[PDB]
Amino acid sequence: SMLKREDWYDLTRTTNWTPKYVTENELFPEEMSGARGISMEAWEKYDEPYKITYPEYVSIQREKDSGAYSIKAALERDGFVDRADPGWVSTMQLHFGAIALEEYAASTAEARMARFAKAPGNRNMATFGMMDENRHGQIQLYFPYANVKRSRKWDWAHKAIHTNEWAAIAARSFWDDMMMTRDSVAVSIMLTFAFETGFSNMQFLGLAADAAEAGDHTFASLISSIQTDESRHAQQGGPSLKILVENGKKDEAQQMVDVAIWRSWKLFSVLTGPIMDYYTPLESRNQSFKEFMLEWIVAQFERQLLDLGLDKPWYWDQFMQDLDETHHGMHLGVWYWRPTVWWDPAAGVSPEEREWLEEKYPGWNDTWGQCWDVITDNLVNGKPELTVPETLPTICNMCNLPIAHTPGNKWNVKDYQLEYEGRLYHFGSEADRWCFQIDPERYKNHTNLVDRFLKGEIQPADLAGALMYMSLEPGVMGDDAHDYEWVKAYQ
């Protein structure tokens, strides 16, 4: 007979001891552990609410890969990818480049808690996390690999994060901040709580739904399988937050949350927002990016924060507001500067699309619509050259994204500048600037692409030079997703 799990589980994580041959601070250096003056004994109250053990893990997970790899092989020959809507193909190419290697990096992040956390339960859960992101990294490489002979853009699933292309820098900027360069407790707050539980869990759910609506079952299955792994390590930051609040640290805990939610939101506004509201064909659109954010992301944070003894971040109302705006900007930026990315951006501004956009966001046409009026007239009138850029845009020094906002009849584009130690920084929002101000030694000598351009680091020092600098050539440089088909609606 076998024991019930309940009966022996605690012994798996009864693994703390009082070092003798070396010191506690030597075995658990503060810069890696982040124990924060709170004692081993107090970290031992850490109690993960979803428990699992080695034999359960390897068993359940062999079952997941079996199914997912089996779905893949069964559908491989039908090559759905050759007849998918190109807004969808693009969606996949962006997902794989931005995510594959960051997922794999997340295993080191988990390895950070596995060695360095003073909570034994945290250390074991992180080991499974480590295993998990090894899975997400590997599979999210195996999948797009099916497609290398179709286009060089698929090579970017591997190559992206190895490049100085702007989106990639933005990506590393976020992840390195969140998970690669913080102490253990901080990783558990900023990554597993704020990002994974806060965003990527509901996002992956929605993305599988979308994939299925697009008739792409290989990818729907891929995403949907990854997602079932999430909560098992996503759970990790909650118990940390409790310990920090129950002891002397509501403020330290608070401040990390404020930082991780804002930084996540920003990445999410360039990577997911545009997709929902512009690449997804009109008639597949279940709900708007603002709606999605309100139903599935925002009320959930409020719940969690209330339940942990924390407050809404200072910027919350501003966040609320920016749901009407940020991502429209991010989309216009990406489409306008499309040769600078590795997928084809979908314009998504046909007449029908535009009345959808106006239902979901009243004011759209008399703000965002204007820039698009000009773009459109230009393509109708045979001036396509005025729809691609001759300069760089100003990049935020925190999120490494263009500084944009509301154009047209309610113009409101602001720059949240800061002079610090003889240098001028640029910020896309009050929050991005505040992230820097609370911890300037963390960001101080970093340089964004514009900085680099201006410093002579990009040579030749013109647009073709920045293309080379970003590893982009014809073949991968993005163009209009639907090859300008939607222009015919206007002649």
Binding site: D7, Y9, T14, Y54, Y69, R115, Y145, S151, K444
Partner: protein, 323 residues
């Protein structure tokens, strides 16, 4: 325009079509793209400094660590196929020997030995798990990191067997204190202090190559010979068939960790000066291992022979790599 390739750009012109293993494991770390600024943030951040010092400045050197290849070629998917198999076998053992009443048939003397020599290994095994998980996060290439990932799950695998058998033993011999007493044994038993010191000290060797050597080439060989080989042959001859089997099953994991460490060492030897570096690190740590094995095995039955056997078998591992 750039042509679609047959395989990843970083793998093109290999002559042989890249394996699954090569496709999902190679050239994945990006922190090594800028040895001067690993992370996309300020270059004086403590983590920037940690990686520069402990990864980049290691004396163990190679021009292309990304060339490293697990000889077992493990990926997540095949790791869990192998380990689900080996776990059906071990959980099988547990189920069926319980059913048999195996723990009831052990003698009091042997039960006492288990409490002292077997149960407290949950600390030593958790500490290897920490050890291997650290190699993961500091090693210079993803294929190195991966070996260390799967080895860290094995280490958890062993902690888990021990945690499990520890309840069963407590359930069968409630007066002995299985499950309550192990910390004080780990902390205060002279038989454990050889290992405890070896592992506490090796746990703070931050340099990636010195961590690899201290954990994989020195501590592991010594823990394995003492706790799997010696206590297991002992277990079998004292009538503990479960632990004789359990221990041999875990030695399968250990032999795999050995195969990749040996491959790494083999690769490091392509470069002039590395043998000396590795040999030097071994000499610093071998004396702590010797002590570990002495303090543990001498307290066993037929103590001195166990010490001679464990010493020489663990040295053999290193001799075979050319060290």
């Amino acid at each position: 325009a750039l042509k679609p390739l047959k395989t990843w750009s970083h793998l093109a012109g290999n002559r042989r079509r890249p394996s699954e293993y090569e496709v999902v494991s190679t050239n994945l770390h990006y922190f090594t793209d800028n040895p001067e600024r690993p992370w996309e943030l300020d270059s004086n951040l403590p983590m920037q400094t940690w990686y520069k010092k402990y990864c980049f400045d290691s004396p163990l050197k190679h021009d292309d660590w990304n060339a490293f290849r697990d000889p077992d070629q493990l990926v997540y998917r095949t790791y869990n196929l192998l380990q689900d198999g080996q776990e059906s076998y071990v959980q099988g053992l547990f189920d069926q020997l319980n059913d048999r009443g195996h723990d009831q048939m052990l003698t009091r003397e042997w039960v006492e030995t288990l409490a002292r020599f077997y149960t407290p290994a949950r600390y030593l095994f958790h500490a290897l798990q920490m050890g291997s998980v650290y190699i993961h996060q500091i090693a210079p290439a993803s294929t190195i990191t991966n070996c260390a990932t799967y080895e860290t799950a094995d280490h958890l695998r062993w902690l888990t067997h021990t945690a499990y058998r520890t309840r069963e033993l407590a359930n069968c011999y409630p007066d002995v204190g299985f499950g309550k007493r192990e910390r004080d044994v780990w902390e205060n038993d002279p038989a454990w202090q050889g290992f405890r010191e070896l592992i506490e000290k090796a746990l703070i060797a931050w340099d990636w190559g010195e961590a690899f050597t201290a954990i994989n080439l020195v501590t592991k060989p010594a823990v394995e010979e003492a706790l799997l080989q010696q206590l297991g042959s002992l277990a079998q001859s004292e009538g503990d068939t479960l632990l004789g089997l359990l221990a041999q099953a875990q030695k399968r994991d250990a032999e795999r960790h050995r195969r990749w460490s040996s491959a790494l060492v083999k690769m490091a030897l392509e470069k002039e000066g590395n043998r000396e570096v590795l040999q030097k690190w071994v000499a610093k740590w071998e004396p702590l291992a010797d002590k570990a094995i002495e303090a543990y095995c001498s307290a066993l039955p037929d103590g001195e022979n166990a010490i001679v056997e464990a010493k020489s078998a663990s040295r053999y591992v290193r001799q075979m790599m050319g060290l």
